[PDB]
Amino acid sequence: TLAFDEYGRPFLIIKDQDRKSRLMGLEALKSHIMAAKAVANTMRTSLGPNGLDKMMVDKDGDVTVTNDGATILSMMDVDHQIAKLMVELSKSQDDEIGDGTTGVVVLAGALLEEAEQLLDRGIHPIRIADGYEQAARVAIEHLDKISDSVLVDIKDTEPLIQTAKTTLGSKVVNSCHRQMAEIAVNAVLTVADMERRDVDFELIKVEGKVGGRLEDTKLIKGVIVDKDFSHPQMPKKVEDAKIAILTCPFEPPKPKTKHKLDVTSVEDYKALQKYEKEKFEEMIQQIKETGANLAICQWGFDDEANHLLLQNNLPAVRWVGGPEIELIAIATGGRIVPRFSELTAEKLGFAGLVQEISFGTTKDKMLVIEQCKNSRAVTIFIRGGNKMIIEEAKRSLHDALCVIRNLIRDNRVVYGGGAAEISCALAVSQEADKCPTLEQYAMRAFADALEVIPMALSENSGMNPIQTMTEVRARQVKEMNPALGIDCLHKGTNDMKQQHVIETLIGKKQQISLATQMVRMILKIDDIRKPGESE
Amino acid sequence: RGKGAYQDRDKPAQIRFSNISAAKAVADAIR
Amino acid sequence: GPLSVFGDRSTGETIRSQNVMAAASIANIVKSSLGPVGLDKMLVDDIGD
Amino acid sequence: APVNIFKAGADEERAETARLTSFIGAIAIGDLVKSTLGPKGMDKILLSSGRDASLMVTNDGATILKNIGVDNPAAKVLVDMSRVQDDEVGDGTTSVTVLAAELLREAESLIAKKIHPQTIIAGWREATKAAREALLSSAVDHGSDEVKFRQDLMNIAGTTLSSKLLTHHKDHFTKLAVEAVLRLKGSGNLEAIHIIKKLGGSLADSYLDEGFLLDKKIGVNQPKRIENAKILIANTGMDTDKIKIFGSRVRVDSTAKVAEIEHAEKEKMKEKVERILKHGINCFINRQLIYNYPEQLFGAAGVMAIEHADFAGVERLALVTGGEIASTFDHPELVKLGSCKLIEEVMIGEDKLIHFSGVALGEACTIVLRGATQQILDEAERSLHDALCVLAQTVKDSRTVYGGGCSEMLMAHAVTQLANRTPGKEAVAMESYAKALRMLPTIIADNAGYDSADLVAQLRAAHSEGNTTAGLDMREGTIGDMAILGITESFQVKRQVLLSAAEAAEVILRVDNIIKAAPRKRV
Amino acid sequence: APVNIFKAGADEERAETARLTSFIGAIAIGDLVKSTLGPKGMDKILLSSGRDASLMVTNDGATILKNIGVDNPAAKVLVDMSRVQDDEVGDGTTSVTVLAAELLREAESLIAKKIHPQTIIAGWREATKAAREALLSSAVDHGSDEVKFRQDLMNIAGTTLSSKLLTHHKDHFTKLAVEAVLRLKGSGNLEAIHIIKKLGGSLADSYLDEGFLLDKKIGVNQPKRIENAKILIANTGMDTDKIKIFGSRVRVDSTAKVAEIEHAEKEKMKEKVERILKHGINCFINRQLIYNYPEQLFGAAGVMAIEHADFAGVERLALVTGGEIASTFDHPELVKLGSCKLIEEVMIGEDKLIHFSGVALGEACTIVLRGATQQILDEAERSLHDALCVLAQTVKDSRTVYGGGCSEMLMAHAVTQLANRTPGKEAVAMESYAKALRMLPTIIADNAGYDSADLVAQLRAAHSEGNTTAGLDMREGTIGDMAILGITESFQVKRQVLLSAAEAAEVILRVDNIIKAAPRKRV
C-alpha cells in the first residue's frame, strides 16, 4: 500500500502520489478504443454527398459553419491524450494530400472498433497490431492494380474537371458545381510547372469581398490589392501601364545613422531650403525619364510629392505591403528598385488596363488587372451573400486546387463511390485464409473495417447497409469485378465509369498507410500517467 | 355583420399607455 | 406612475418647513454672542486644534 | 457524445436541440422586426442600461438588429445576412429578414414530417430558380425620354420613404431626395450629398442648399463678404515648417545669430504667402490649421482664410467649386481656381455657417435638416440616407418591378405552377417556398390592421388569370393596379432579397450539431 | 399588469405568455406518450429520485402520466383527463391524450391567424357533433348467435393486448382474458378474477386456475386433505371475545374463584366451537385470527381452520363457494354450506397454496402469472387488468367500431363534408378538428416506421369513395379491410376518446390570464 507501510510508517515513492491514477490491464486498451468511438461517431456524420455540416463556436464567440474536417477537428476542446492523436491523423492527411479529412478518422476508428473483439478472444495486443500489417499490405497491393488515366495536362482536361467536380460535390457550393470546377482547373494549369510537376502554392492568391453571390466568383489573370491613390483627383484609369515598383519614401533622402546637422549662419539656413526643394523635383523627374506612367510604392508620400505627381500626370498609390509589391513585380515582369536614382526603363513592369472597383456603398477600391504578359500568378476573387459561405468557399476551392495538384504530382487515379474500398475488402478476405496460422481473426477484422466507408455512405444516403452491401459485393464476384459503387439517387446504375466518380491513387494509399500507423501507436499502450487536481 | 374583427393581443396594448403616464409625471413637475 | 428620477422629491410644506429650521439652527448659535454681555465660543476640530 | 464526455469546459448538442434551438433563434429575430414590415409599421426604442445609454428610435430592420447583441450562435447567421443587405442596397433589410424566417418556419414543419434535410434544400433550390425568372421576365426598362424616368424616380423615392418617419411630409422630402440625386450628374458616390442636422423648426422647414456650407468662421482681420470670388483651396502647411531635415539644430556662438535666423523664418513665411497670392485669389481654404502669422499676411491682401473645415473638405470643395487640392503653390499658371457669387455667412438655427452661393460646376449639394428633437433628426437623417442610396443606384440600373406584393405574388405563382409538375417527394417543399413568399403581403396587411385573410385570397384569384400588375393597396384596404397607383420597387433590391434569403436559410438547415467552446474571462 | 403591481408575493401573465406557455406545457404531454400509440410502440421506464426508487416499466399512458409530477397549471388539465379515461373504460388512454394535444396544437396555429378564441371553440363544438354522428351511424351490433359473439370478445381482447408487453403470447393470454370474464356470468366487479404473481417460468407458462387459491396454510394439528369437503366461512371471534360489557372487573375474596372463572372462560369457548361444529363441516375459514385453544378443538374434531386469509377474502369465498358470511352461529339449520372436491395444497413457484378444486357455483377464478423478472410480472399483470376491464363492459354493451384508423377517418370525413358547407369564419376551425382526427392514424404509422405519407393518402382516398371498413394493416404496411382482419374496438372506448378530448381542450382555449398565488413552504 501507498502512504501506509506494514510498520505503520508513511510510504512515499513519488511526489503527490495520492493524486495520481494508474490502471493497466486490458482497461487501458478498452478505454483507448472506447474513446476513439466517441471521435468516430462525430466524423461519420459528414461523409458522402449528403454529409451534414457542423457549427463551431469559438472561445471568443465567433461562429463559422463548415463541412471541412480540418476545420471541425481543429476546434475541439477534448482533454484526452489519444483523442488528440486522432486529430493529428486528419492533419497529416490534410498536409500530404488534402482530401481525406473525414476518411482517415472513420477508417482508423473502424480498425479500433473491430479490434475490440480480438482482445476479448485473448489475442495478444501486439499480435493484433502486427496482424493489421499483413492484411494492409494486401489491400495496398491490390489498390495499385486497377488504375488508368488519359489526362495529359495540355488540352484534354475533361477528366481533370471531373475530378474537381467529384471533390466539390461534397461541399456547399454545388450551385457553382461547374463554375468553380473550371476556375480551379484554370488557376493551377496557368501556374503549374510541367517540367518538374511542381505547383507553387504562393502563385495562386485567394481574395474575397462580402456581397453578391457565389456565381460572381471570377479568376483574375493578375493581382488584386487595396488601391488608395495618394492624390484624390488623380485619374483612376490607365490603359497601358508602365509600372515602377519602388521601395523608397517620396521624401528627401536621409542617412540611417545619427546625423545632427549643424546650422550656424543665415546662409546655411536659407541654402538648405533651396536644396531640399530641388530634391523633391529630381525624385519625380527621375521617374518620368524612364517613361513610367504608374508608380507603386511600399512607403508613403510627402505633401510636396502629391502635387508633383499631379502636374507630371504620374498616378501612384501608397503603403502597398511587402507581399503585395513582391507579387506585383513578379506578375508584371519587373524588378523592385531600391532608390530613385537607380530607376531605369529596363526594370519597369508591363500591364494592361488598371482599374479600381467600387462595391455598393463601401470604399474598398479593389484593383483589377485586365491584361498581362506571360504572368505566372493568378488571383481568385470570391463573392458571397454572407461571411460564412465565403469562408467555406475558400476551403471548397482549396480542396479543388489540392486534388488538381495531386494529379499533377501523380496522374494515376482510381474509381470512387466505395468501389475501391469494397474491392479491397473482398481481396483481403480472399487472402485472409492463405494461411490461417494465428492471424485469421485479425486479417478478417481488417477486411471488415474497410467496409465502414460504403456502410456509412449508405446510411447517410438513406439506404440500409445490409441491403446495399450484400448486392454490390455479390455483383462484384458473379461477374468480372466492375467499378461498381453506391450512390443516393443511383443515377440509373452504380457504374462509377459512367458517373465519373474519380479519386486519386496516392490519396487512398496515404489514407490506408497513415490510418494503420496511427492505430498501432495507440494500441501498444497499457499505462497512462495523467495528473489529477493541482492540490 | 361586423365586417370582420382585428384581434390585437400583444405588448403595445400596455406600452402605449405607460409611455403617456411617464410623460405626465414629468409634465406636471413644473405645473 | 411616479416621477422616474432616481432621487427624492419633496414639495409643499415639507421643504418650506425644513428651510426655516435650517435657518433657525444657525441663528440659535449667533444669538448667544450679541452685545457686550455675550460670551466666547470654543471650536475644536477633528485633529485637536 | 453525451456518454463518456472527454471535453474540458466545452459541450455539444446533436440531433435533438441543435436544430430546435437554431429554429427558435431564427424565428426570434423574425418576430422582432416583423412589426416594421410595410408602410404602417411601428417604431422601436433601443436603449442600454447606462454608461451613455445612447437612446435611439429606429425603424429599419438592419439598424434594429445591429444594436441588439444576439448571443445565440445560430441566430447570428441571419444577423449577418441583414448586415450585407444594408451594405449593398440599403433597403428591404426587414423584408429579407422576415422572408428568411418564414422559410425556416416551414422547414421546421417539413423536418418534423420526416423529410430528409437535403430533400428540403433541393426543393428550395428549384423553387428559387423559378422565382428568379419571375423577377427577370417582369422587369420594366427605362431608357431615353427623361421626362418619363423622372416620374419613376418620384415613385421610387416615395415607396422607400413611406416606411420611415417621413410619412406625411412627402410633399417636401420626396422631391428633396430625387433632386439631390439628379444634381449629382455622375457616379453614385453618396459622399457629395452632405446632411447637416440642426434643432429648431419642423421637418417641413428643411431645404436643399444649391451651394456649399463650411464651418470655421471667417478669420479675424479679413472681409466677411466678397462678391464674385475666385476660390483657391489648400492642403499644405502654414507654420512650424521644420523643413524635411530630421536631426538639425542651430549651433551658434552668440545671440545675434539666433535673432538673424528668426528673421529668416518670418522672411520664409512672407514668401510663402506671396507665392500663393500670385494666383489672384479671393479665398484660401487649407485643411491644416492656419496660424496668426499668415492670417495677418492674408488679411492685408483681402483674402479669406478658412482653416480645418474638415479632413476631406478639400475634396468636396474641389468638386463643388471647380478647383484642385493644390498641396503645393509654386506654379500659379498650372493651378485652377474655383468660382462662386457670394461667400457670405448665414445664420442657420442660431449657428453661423459660411455659405458658398452660386458656385460654378457645383457637382454636390448640402441638405439642411431641421427638427424638434434629436430623435426626429437622427431618424430623418437615416430616412434620407436610405432613399438616396436606392435612388443613386436606380439611376444606374433602370430596371424596376411592381411593388405592393405584386412581385411576391408573381414569384409565388411561378413556383406553384412548376411545383405541380414535380413528384411529391420535392413538391411539398416547393409549396412551402411559395407560402413564405405569400406570407410577406400577409404580414404587411396584418401590421396595418387589414383583414389579410380575404385580401390574400383576392390576390391569389386576381393573379390566376393575367392581372400581372395587381397588388395590395395599403391606402384603401383593397386590391388595385400598381401601375396606376404608382407603387414600384427597384429590380436590384428585390433580386437580393430573393437570393440571400435562400442562401442564408440553407446554411442553417444543414447544421445538425453545434459544438461550443469553453468561454474565457467569464467567472 | 407588470406596471403598478399591487400583489403581495403573487404574479400573473396576460395575453402574451399565458397562452404561449399553456400550449407548450400541455401539448408536450402528447409528445411524451405519443410513442406508445399503436402495436409497434416502445415502452418507457420511469425512475424516482431515490429512497426505494421502485423502478416501473410500463406502456400505458395513464400509468406514465400519473407518475410524472406535472407542475405546469395548464398541463395538469390533460393529466386529469387521462385519469378519467382510465377510470371509466380502462383503454385508449394514449389515444385521448395525443388527440387533445393535437387539437391544442391546431388552436395555437388558429390564434396566429387572428381568429377569435370563441370562434375556434364554436367551430370545434360543431365539428364534435359531426364526429359523434359518424360513430353512431357506424356502430356494429352483436346480439344472439353466440358463435359470432364469442369471436367479437376474442377480437376485442386481441386488439387491447397487442399494444402491451404480451405481444407474441396472444395465444395464451387472449383466452385468459375472454374466458375468465365469461365464467363470471354476473356483475363486473373486476375483483372476482385474482392474479397471483410468481417468479419462475416464462409468460407463456401462465395458466387459469379453475378453482380458488388461499394463503395461510392448513393449521398445525389439522387434516391436510379431505375429499368431498363441506366449506363453512365465518367472520366471528375466536378468542378474547370480551362479551359486550365495557368496564367490568372480577373482584373476589381469593384466587380460588379466579381459577374457577378461568375454567368457565374455556367452557364457553368450548361450547362456541361445538355450536360451529354441529353444522357438519370439513373446512372452516374465519377472518379473525385463530388462537391456540380453538386450534386444538378444531384439530381434535378433524376439521381444518384457516385464519385471516384476507380482509375481503371471506367475501370472495362466499361468492365462489355459494355460502354466507356467518358472523354469528346460533341457528345451524339456517346456515348454508359450500362444497368442493379437493382442499389439497399445491406447490406453485416454491410456495404452498391451498387449492379449492371443483367448487360448486364457482363464480370466480384465479390467474397464475409467471415471469422471469419483477418488471415483466408487473406489466403483464397490468395487461390482464386492462383487457379484463374492457371485456367486462363489452359483454354489457356489444356495440363496436372498426379500428386501425377506420373510425378516425370516418369521423374526419363527416367533419370535412359538413365544414365545407359553412362560412369560412368557422369552417377554418371545423377543418382543424378533422385534421387532428387524422393525426391518430398518422402517429400509429409513424411509430411503426411505415411511410405515413402514403398510408394516410390511401386511407383517405379509400374512405372518400365508400370503403367504410378500410384501415391500416400494421403487419404489411398497407390498407386493408378491418372486418376481414378482425380489428375492432369497443364503442364506449371510442366515444369517450372523442368527447373527452373535445371537452378538455376547451378548458385551455378559454383561458387568457393565469394568476399564480404566492408559494408556501419554499425557502
Short mmCIF file of C-alpha atoms in Angstrom, two decimals, chain B residues 7, chain D residues 34 105 439 442-443 446 452, chain E residues 19 23 105-116 120:
data_model
loop_
_atom_site.label_atom_id
_atom_site.label_comp_id
_atom_site.label_asym_id
_atom_site.label_seq_id
_atom_site.Cartn_x
_atom_site.Cartn_y
_atom_site.Cartn_z
CA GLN B 7 -57.54 40.68 -32.68
CA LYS D 34 -41.84 41.76 -38.21
CA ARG D 105 -40.66 28.16 -40.06
CA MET D 439 -46.56 35.46 -46.00
CA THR D 442 -49.96 38.84 -45.37
CA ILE D 443 -47.73 40.37 -42.67
CA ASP D 446 -51.58 42.48 -40.65
CA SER D 452 -55.40 39.72 -44.59
CA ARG E 19 -51.44 31.12 -23.69
CA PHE E 23 -49.98 25.49 -25.13
CA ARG E 105 -51.57 22.49 -31.35
CA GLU E 106 -54.01 23.48 -34.10
CA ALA E 107 -55.63 26.08 -31.83
CA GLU E 108 -52.31 27.89 -31.40
CA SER E 109 -51.96 27.97 -35.20
CA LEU E 110 -55.50 29.36 -35.49
CA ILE E 111 -54.74 32.12 -32.96
CA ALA E 112 -51.78 33.08 -35.14
CA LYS E 113 -54.34 33.66 -37.92
CA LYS E 114 -56.11 36.21 -35.64
CA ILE E 115 -59.18 34.01 -35.15
CA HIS E 116 -61.09 34.93 -32.00
CA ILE E 120 -62.38 28.48 -32.56
#
